[PDB]
Symmetry: C2
Subunit: 149 residues, 2 copies
């Protein structure tokens, strides 16, 4: 039966482990089964980085109905704007409930989840030559933004 | 648990900029930009239908239209993954309302505990602890993660 709307639930089959989300935490070591869940992929991929996991998922999706299930759902989330691609390394990033800001696990770029784009310009933190420019001229990057760092 | 925050919903009118924050006791969003009523349980605009009629009509349209079937097959995935459930009383598909651990069904008005994916109460409604998740009975939450299932 899982857990709260505020929680991530472990992906080990039938595991009762769960956690809350935190802006600067992208992995969850389940205290029940001890497997490391990646919160951006919503998957356990302990032998791979996220790009390797997602490229392998697309490969398995050609001859596996359950992987094809997963990938075609991601395609719809991407189109609906529920997920996004990292603007730097282009992995698929899925939402962490209540987090307006994400640091990519693969390339470490800061992502403004509210606007579905980079937080900063190419110079990184403090570079408002690009990115969402939250609170430049006092204006939030979107009226719904509470804290995109 | 987590730092209390507000969770946004975006209007389903194509390319509309309207948006709102989710609230426990609000299941409909009247967009202030386009004035269309969004149902926050179906995540769709179905102003001439109740939610059961909308979901039944969507399943019908799935057999011939491409977009309707990717919508319905996504819901079936969401059901197995646990990002959605069926109302324990009237059995419509209920999608997660971000930041809400309690939901009052739009069709039958049954209170739903999202945390346990089931009824909040027994058959007698509020206060009936003969069924439901029994949250806070003897000071014990219905699940350690529960943030407020009323
Ligand atoms: Zn686990
Ligand atoms: Zn990952
Ligand atoms: Zn990246
Ligand atoms: Zn931002
Ligand atoms: Zn912002
Ligand atoms: Zn609108
Ligand atoms: Zn509805
Ligand atoms: Zn119902
Ligand atoms: Zn409950
Ligand atoms: Zn509860």
């Amino acid at each position: 039966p899982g857990s709260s709307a505020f929680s991530y639930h472990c992906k080990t089959p039938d595991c009762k482990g769960w956690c809350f989300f935190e802006d600067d935490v992208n992995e969850f070591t389940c205290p029940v089964c001890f497997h490391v869940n990646c919160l951006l992929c919503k998957a356990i991929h302990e032998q791979m980085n996220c790009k390797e996991y997602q490229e392998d998922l697309a490969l398995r999706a050609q001859n596996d109905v359950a992987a094809r299930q997963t990938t075609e759902m991601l395609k719809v989330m991407l189109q609906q704007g529920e997920a996004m691609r990292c603007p730097q390394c282009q992995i698929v990033v899925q939402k962490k409930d209540g987090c307006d800001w994400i640091r990519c696990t693969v390339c470490h770029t800061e992502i403004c989840w509210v606007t579905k784009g980079p937080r900063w310009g190419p110079g990184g933190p403090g570079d408002t030559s690009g990115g969402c420019r939250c609170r430049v001229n006092g204006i939030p990057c979107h009226p719904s933004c509470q804290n995109c760092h």
